[PDB]
Amino acid sequence: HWGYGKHNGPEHWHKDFPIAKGERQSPVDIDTHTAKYDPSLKPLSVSYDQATSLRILNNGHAFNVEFDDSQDKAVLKGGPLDGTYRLIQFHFHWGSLDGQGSEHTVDKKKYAAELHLVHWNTKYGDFGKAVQQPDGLAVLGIFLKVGSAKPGLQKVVDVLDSIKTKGKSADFTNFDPRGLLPESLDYWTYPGSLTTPPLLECVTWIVLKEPISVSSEQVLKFRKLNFNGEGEPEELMVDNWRPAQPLKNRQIKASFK
Ligand SMILES: NS(=O)(=O)c1nnc(NC(=O)[C@]23C[C@H]4C[C@H](C[C@H](C4)C2)C3)s1
Numbered sequence: 001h002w003g004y005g006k007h008n009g010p011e012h013w014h015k016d017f018p019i020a021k022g023e024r025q026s027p028v029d030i031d032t033h034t035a036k037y038d039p040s041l042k043p044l045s046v047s048y049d050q051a052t053s054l055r056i057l058n059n060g061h062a063f064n065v066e067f068d069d070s071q072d073k074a075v076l077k078g079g080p081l082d083g084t085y086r087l088i089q090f091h092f093h094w095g096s097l098d099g100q101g102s103e104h105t106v107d108k109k110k111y112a113a114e115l116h117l118v119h120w121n122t123k124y125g126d127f128g129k130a131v132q133q134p135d136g137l138a139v140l141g142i143f144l145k146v147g148s149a150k151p152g153l154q155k156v157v158d159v160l161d162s163i164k165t166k167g168k169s170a171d172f173t174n175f176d177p178r179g180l181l182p183e184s185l186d187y188w189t190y191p192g193s194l195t196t197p198p199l200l201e202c203v204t205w206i207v208l209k210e211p212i213s214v215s216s217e218q219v220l221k222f223r224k225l226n227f228n229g230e231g232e233p234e235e236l237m238v239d240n241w242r243p244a245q246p247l248k249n250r251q252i253k254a255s256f257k
């Protein structure tokens with residue numbers, strides 16, 4: 001089944017998931033000179049003060065930190081969004097090398113990794129219904145570069161030893177996702193898709209202009225994870241990113257100049 005290897009990687013996904021060649025696929029290259037400033041875009045509202053993290057899980061393609069999304073505890077609104085979107089999970093995509101790993105690119109530049117905070121539109125009642133709607137999800141994307149350590153990421157890094165292999169989970173309570181945000185909330189936005197199968201076209205992408213910096217040691221610990229389950233041959237979880245897809249009939253908008 002699908003993955004990031006030579007025989008099941010992004011170039012193969014379209015066989016099981018024909019929408020891979022669809023009209024609003026993600027990620028994309030963000031051409032900063034062609035992105036249109038949109039003065040009517042509202043400031044993002046990130047309200048994570050009441051966030052309740054529950055668990056961290058190695059799902060065989062990345063690790064997800066999951067949140068309680070049965071009430072409005074951590075929500076995203078404003079920006080290009082109408083209504084309220086609840087945080088359900090975050091995860092990362094990263095490379096085998098610092099020069100690659102992000103899914104979105106900026107003027108063709110790849111970052112070392114990319115964080116996705118996934119939210120769903122509460123008007124649809126649950127995440128399963130939301131992914132079937134064109135405005136069902138809002139994903140906040142944040143680039144990572146290697147430099148100084150990100151203090152707020154360290155609790156994540158330190159639990160990875162306990163979820164090395166596919167299917168492993170660990171209690172992960174009281175984690176504050178605010179510690180992963182850059183200083184500025186300036187963003188680009190466009191309509192797109194999930195970047196992993198089923199590749200559903202249900203996402204309003206909000207990609208922050210300002211990367212966070214993480215340390216060499218922090219990203220190295222990401223790369224010690226495994227795609228495989230325990231007792232299966234070891235394959236390091238690296239390069240779990242989908243490359244840029246055709247923009248087609250879409251305009252990327254900027255919240256800033
Ligand atoms: N890379 S990306 O952000 O476009 C995404 N690509 N796929 C995502 N899938 C989900 O978010 C899931 C959310 C919760 C329910 C479903 C099962 C777990 C827990 C995963 C799907 S995000």
Ligand SMILES: [Zn+2]
Nearest residue numbers: 091093116195
């Ligand atoms: Zn993702």
